[PDB]
Amino acid sequence: RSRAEYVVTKLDDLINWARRSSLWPMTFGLACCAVEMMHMAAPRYDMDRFGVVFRASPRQADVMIVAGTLTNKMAPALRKVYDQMPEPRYVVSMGSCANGGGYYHYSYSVVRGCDRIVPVDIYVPGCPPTAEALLYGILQLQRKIKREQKLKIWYRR
Amino acid sequence: MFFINILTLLVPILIAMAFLTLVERKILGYMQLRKGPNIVGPYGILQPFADAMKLFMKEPMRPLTTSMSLFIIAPTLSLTLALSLWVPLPMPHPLINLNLGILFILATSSLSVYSILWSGWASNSKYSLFGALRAVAQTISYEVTMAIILLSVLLMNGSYSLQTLITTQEHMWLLLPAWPMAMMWFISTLAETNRAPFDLTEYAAGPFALFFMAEYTNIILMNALTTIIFLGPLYYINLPELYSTNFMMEALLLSSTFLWIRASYPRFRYDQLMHLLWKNFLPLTLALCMWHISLPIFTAGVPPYM
Amino acid sequence: SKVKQDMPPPGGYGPIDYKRNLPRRGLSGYSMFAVGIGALIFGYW
Amino acid sequence: MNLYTVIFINILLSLTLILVAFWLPQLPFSMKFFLVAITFLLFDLEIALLLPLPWAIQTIKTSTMMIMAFILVTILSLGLAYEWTQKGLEWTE
Amino acid sequence: TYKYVNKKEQESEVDMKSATDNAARILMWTELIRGLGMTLSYLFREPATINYPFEKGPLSPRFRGEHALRRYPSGEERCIACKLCEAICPAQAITIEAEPRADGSRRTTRYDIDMTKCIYCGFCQEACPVDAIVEGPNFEFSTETHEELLYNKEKLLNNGDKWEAEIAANIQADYLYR
Amino acid sequence: EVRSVFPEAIIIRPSDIFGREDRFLNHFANYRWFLAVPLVSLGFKTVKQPVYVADVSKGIVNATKDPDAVGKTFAFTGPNRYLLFHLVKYIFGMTHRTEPWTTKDKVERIHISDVMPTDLPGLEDLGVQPTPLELKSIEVLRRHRTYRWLSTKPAKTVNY
Ligand SMILES: CCCCCCCCCCCCCCCCCC(=O)OC[C@H](COP(=O)([O-])OCC[N+](C)(C)C)OC(=O)CCCCCCCCCCCCCCCCC
Ligand SMILES: CCCCCCCCCCCCCCCCCC(=O)OC[C@H](COP(=O)(O)OCCN)OC(=O)CCCCCCCCCCCCCCCCC
Ligand code: SF4
Ligand code: SF4
Ligand code: SF4
């Protein structure tokens, strides 16, 4: 192909590498799944070693880890915090509650999945899914945002 | 040649800042029975570069209600004051030899607390403004105790120069004559840099990266200043590389001491921090200030003007 | 047959030192004050 | 000229950093804070008085200088003691 | 019985040596220095970090992971459409429809398990009378869409055919306990 | 060409659509970043009736579900006609203050007046009541206000 598209592809590689190497989350943590989140933060799995910084503010956050049961009383707060997060933002839903309501699916005060409120990038299944599996979801997110070609789309505009 | 000397001073300082972020991550991980970043790069040496590139690549969520003037001014001011703080430092020879370099240092810290106050007022939130007022009061109180401590130790030294400090330190460390002053100066530098246990903690992407850069640069500088003042490196007129290496080693130990303290201790309360300063340091600071006024008079050890 | 089941050893498990054990290490207050004052006087001289 | 060059380089570097940072992505008053602010004003001006001591230590009349410095740091201590006794240093309703 | 965590016996008086010890403790930061020292000791230990994904956390054959539908060694489906798994399923995550097959066998026409509704409790695999539904040890099956976690009979049979070399071994290792 | 290849295509012609993410109200708000307002003939010759994006979408959905809309052309317009200058005055006074940004085609379409929809059916014929810019303008221009002005008379409407 053209020489300019090669440079554009390499620039996409650099930008995607930066975004997946420096992935700062805030965990909108509610429950059991947030406990298992901090077990992934724990020294065995070491997302800080992976480049993923524990306890970041929503202003400095890249991905929101929806960890727990999203209730009707909490969904406006979830949407507000998601709106306060800057534009390059991803969503990792974790657990059956945040995925599709889970064990409280037929409840009067439980939102059937956080995808009804925020656009979810990756769903992590389990109740709770292990910290091993959540770290799998994070690495899958890094691969997914490695697959992005934003300057390639812009050049092909 | 002077511009080359400017470049070879400032660029390695920024490299030291980025790798200070990396070594803080690694030391905190290894003190928490885990590892630092090592996947990003060979042994994590590309992790601060990835962090900086992501921070400059992410779009800054700029609220329209925030004043663009102050939003611009605060981080650029903080970084330029960190670098201006770095310039008049002899290692054992400075880029710029100032007659009153320590006064220059303290007043540059005053302009830094302008920077944090302006950032807090620009951040249009009442909780942000409250935390800003708390942080300015913290920085201000530890600045007044730094100024009195530093005045007394230069009453022992002789002038506000730093080569005069090197000539003072070429026989022994100032830590032995002024070690409680050294302890209070160390705590004061900690609370200036807003490190744990005095952190007591708004900006996204670019400005956040700039504030992070300036804060870590100030951390390295407080370590270097503590080294140059209280713990004199070995100086010889026929070789300055020994002084540079020994100052390097002591600055690395003091930076590791800040990361050590952050790992070890829980943070203070705001009332407890003000109580600690205004009821334990400043009485001791004033008493030792008058003691170090009295000391050359009754020992006849009045230092020379040069 | 013979039942196989998760059981403790016949001699029993060893003792577990569940009590608090602070090492009680440290130089004395009088002598650290003495060495601090001595360092002060040596530095002053 | 040297310090002018370094400060200009510092300001230019910080300004280009904020410029590439932007171009690359394409009430209830509390009295006690004012109290510690003015206490800092008073103590900082007392520092401004105390600062010429590295040149005042070289005077011929060391006794008068010592007496003035002693009296001044004593009234620092007395003012701080006043504020401590009348509760200007605590954060309590 | 009971014990005191903060009460101290009688008084240790007020001695000059004890006062000097307390003054040295809160003037030279002895407890702070010893806390720094043992944090340095942890700096000098070995980290407990495993090398994911090249190293995996240890598990047990009892592990309740991704659901799967097994087979007999002949190749016939073990499931006999008896609906106890969806009867006992506490989250109601199993939906079963059944009819006689062309040879008259009692088999399912629909066996859907919702991963987003499942709580991964093993009640289906412990209520299954023929060891058909199992919670195999797969846990690295996070998807990018909500639909891909809505399993059906074909997906569950594919999972059973994929993980049969491990699920059968785990059942062989653990079936004497259950 | 669409009518040639698909003879029963429903053609919908809306006016300058305003909304939260539009390039009309945000565009006129972003003229303030320059020194003044660059209006050709001071905007008196141009008459516009903007239409809400939710109204246009409701009309589109009702055209999908409507049996009588087949092979028809609709005009989706707002209930009130404003001059360009009065529209700029209203948006600037509502904000209270005082991908190229703009192109020659964009300013030409801005300075082209809106025709009178007379023969064409409209939103009321597809079952959508046209909500006005006065009612649905606060949620758009609030993001351009200042803090003092975070916590205005309508522009007058002409028949022609
Ligand atoms: C410069 C090189 C490096 C030096 C430092 C090395 C690293 C050390 C790091 C230690 C951990 C620090 C982490 C933050 C801790 C914050 C808390 C803290 O420190 O609180 C301070 C604590 C506060 O104590 P507190 O919290 O118990 O409060 C006291 C008040 N009461 C008890 C009523 C509540 O101590 C001090 O303020 C004392 C400071 C040191 C004073 C030393 C005086 C020595 C003697 C003086 C000279 C006397 C003789 C004169 C000459 C005579 C000649 C004959
Ligand atoms: C974003 C907006 C930011 C606004 C604030 C900017 C702050 C910048 C960082 C802090 C700079 C502090 C400078 C303080 C003044 C210098 C202090 C000093 O000691 O100066 C005296 C010194 C020579 O004195 P002495 O040591 O006695 O030497 C004689 C013996 N050989 O040296 C001299 O006599 C040199 C005299 C000039 C020294 C200062 C140079 C300032 C340069 C201009 C800065 C502003 C430029 C315009 C705006 C740019 C865009 C913002
Ligand atoms: S999915 Fe399960 S483990 Fe997670 S929050 Fe819900 S009930 Fe708890
Ligand atoms: S493990 Fe899941 S599918 Fe099986 S019974 Fe429990 S909730 Fe239902
Ligand atoms: S319990 Fe087992 S055999 Fe019965 S319907 Fe469920 S999977 Fe099939």
Give the domain CATH number at D18.
1.20.58.1610
Pairwise CA distance, residues F57 & F67, whole Å: 17
Which residue ranges make up each domain of chain B? 2-306
Yes or no: say if B31 and B263 are a contact pair by the CB < 8 Å rule. Answer: yes
Q: Name the residue type at position B150.
A: L
- From the list A37, A54, A53, the residue with the least C-alpha distance to A95 is A37
Q: What are phi and psi of E134, to 5 degrees?
A: -135, 155
Pairwise CA distance, residues B3 & E26, whole Å: 50
The SS3 assignment for F17 reads strand
Pairwise CA distance, residues E119 & A97, whole Å: 9
Residue B130 has, within 13 A of its CA and on its CB side, a CA count of 10
Q: Which residue has the tokens 């004012």?
A: D34
User: CA-nearest residue of chain B to D20?
Assistant: B56
Q: Name the residue type at position D75.
A: I
- From the list B107, B109, B145, the residue with the least C-alpha distance to D40 is B145
Pairwise CA distance, residues C45 & C39, whole Å: 10
End-to-end CA distance of chain A: 17
DSSP B223: H
Q: Which residue has the tokens 């050893």?
A: C9
DSSP A87: S
- From the list B221, B234, B304, the residue with the least C-alpha distance to B92 is B234
DSSP-derived secondary structure for E143-170: BSSSGGGEE-HHHHHHHHHHSHHHHHHH
Instruction: Kindly give the residue spans of alpha helices, DSSP state H, lying in chain E.
Output: 16-28, 30-43, 84-88, 123-127, 153-162, 164-174
D72's CB contacts (< 8 A; 6+ apart) are D46, D49, D50
B7, B95, D4 from B1: Cα distances, Å? 10, 11, 16
Residues preceding chain discontinuities in chain F with C to N over 2.5 Å: 98, 151
Cα dihedral B255, B259, B262, B265 sign? negative
The SS3 assignment for B192 reads helix
Yes or no: say if B273 and B200 are a contact pair by the CB < 8 Å rule. Answer: yes
The alpha carbon of residue B140 is apart from the nearest alpha carbon of chain E, in Å, by: 24
Domain range for D7 is: 2-93
B115, B219, B224, B289, C18 from B155: Cα distances, Å? 30, 25, 20, 9, 55
The SS3 assignment for B72 reads helix
Is residue A60 packed enough to be buried (19+ CB in 10 Å), middle (13-18) or exposed (0-12)? buried
Q: Per the structure, how many domains does chain A have?
A: 1
Domain range for A127 is: 3-157
Interface subset of E 79-138, CB within 8 angstroms of B: none
What are the structure tokens assigned to E117, written together? 């509704």
**Contact E128 CB / ligand 5 (< 6 Å):** yes
- From the list F48, F45, F57, the residue with the least C-alpha distance to F21 is F57
Yes or no: say if C36 and B179 are a contact pair by the CB < 8 Å rule. Answer: yes
- From the list B247, B255, B228, B222, the residue with the least C-alpha distance to B146 is B222
User: CA-nearest residue of chain B to C40?
Assistant: B177
Pairwise CA distance, residues B170 & B232, whole Å: 7
Pairwise CA distance, residues F49 & F14, whole Å: 10
The strand pairing partners of E113, in sequence order, are E94, E151
Instruction: Kindly give the residue spans of alpha helices, DSSP state H, lying in chain B.
Output: 2-31, 47-57, 68-86, 101-122, 126-157, 163-169, 179-193, 206-230, 241-264, 270-276, 282-299
Yes or no: say if F93 and F152 are a contact pair by the CB < 8 Å rule. Answer: yes
**Contact B263 CB / ligand 1 (< 6 Å):** no
Pairwise CA distance, residues B169 & B231, whole Å: 8
Is residue A71 packed enough to be buried (19+ CB in 10 Å), middle (13-18) or exposed (0-12)? middle
Pairwise CA distance, residues F142 & E96, whole Å: 53
Give 3-state DSSP helix, strand, coil % of chain F, rounded to 5. Answer: 40, 10, 50
Yes or no: say if E144 and E83 are a contact pair by the CB < 8 Å rule. Answer: no
The strand pairing partners of B1, in sequence order, are none
C1's CB contacts (< 8 A; 6+ apart) are none
A47, B41, B55 from E50: Cα distances, Å? 11, 18, 28
Residues preceding chain discontinuities in chain D with C to N over 2.5 Å: 26
DSSP-derived secondary structure for A61-95: -SEEEEES--BTTTHHHHHHHHHHS-SS-EEEEEH
Helix axes B206-230, B101-122, angle to 10 degrees: 150
Pairwise CA distance, residues B78 & B215, whole Å: 8
Pairwise CA distance, residues F23 & F106, whole Å: 10
Pairwise CA distance, residues E71 & E77, whole Å: 4
Q: Name the residue type at position A50.
A: F
The SS3 assignment for D12 reads helix
Yes or no: say if A62 and B95 are a contact pair by the CB < 8 Å rule. Answer: no
Write the Ramachandran bin of B300: left for phi over 0, alpha for psi from -120 to 50, otherwise beta: left
E108's CB contacts (< 8 A; 6+ apart) are E79, E81, E96, E97, E98, E153
Pairwise CA distance, residues B169 & B172, whole Å: 5
Q: Per the structure, how many domains does chain D have?
A: 1
Helix axes B126-157, B179-193, angle to 10 degrees: 150
Contacts of B64 in chain F (CB under 8 A): 143-146
What are the structure tokens assigned to D63, written together? 């006794």
The SS3 assignment for E63 reads coil
DSSP A92: E
The alpha carbon of residue A57 is apart from the nearest alpha carbon of chain E, in Å, by: 25
Yes or no: say if F53 and F92 are a contact pair by the CB < 8 Å rule. Answer: no
Q: Outline where DSSP puts E strands in chain A.
A: 25-29, 63-67, 90-94, 122-124
Q: Which residue has the tokens 């340091």?
A: B281
For chain C, give the longest Cα–Cα distance: 88
Buried b (16+ CB within 10 A) or exposed e, B244-269: eebbeebbbebbbebbbbbbbbeebe
**Contact C40 CB / ligand 1 (< 6 Å):** yes
Buried b (16+ CB within 10 A) or exposed e, B74-87: bbbbbbbbbbbbbb
Write the Ramachandran bin of F52: left for phi over 0, alpha for psi from -120 to 50, otherwise beta: beta
The SS3 assignment for F53 reads helix
Pairwise CA distance, residues B43 & B56, whole Å: 23
Q: Name the residue type at position A53.
A: V
Pairwise CA distance, residues F99 & F82, whole Å: 28
**Contact B163 CB / ligand 1 (< 6 Å):** no
Yes or no: say if B259 and B27 are a contact pair by the CB < 8 Å rule. Answer: yes
Which residues of E belong to the annotated binding site for [4Fe-4S] cluster?
79, 82, 85, 89, 118, 121, 124, 128
Length of chain A: 157
For chain D, give the longest Cα–Cα distance: 69
Touching C (3+ Cβ pairs <8 A), the chains are B, E
DSSP-derived secondary structure for C1-45: ---------TT-PPP---S---------HHHHHHHHHHHHHHHH-
Q: Cβ–Cβ contacts within 10 Å for residue B235, how many?
A: 18
Yes or no: say if B54 and B98 are a contact pair by the CB < 8 Å rule. Answer: no
Pairwise CA distance, residues F143 & B270, whole Å: 36
- From the list B55, B1, B103, the residue with the least C-alpha distance to B209 is B55
C21's CB contacts (< 8 A; 6+ apart) are none
User: CA-nearest residue of chain A to B206?
Assistant: A60
Q: Is residue A143 less than 8 Å (CB to CB) from chain B?
A: no
Say what the alpha-carbon torsion angle C10, C13, C14, C16 is, to the nearest 10 degrees: -160
Is residue F28 packed enough to be buried (19+ CB in 10 Å), middle (13-18) or exposed (0-12)? buried
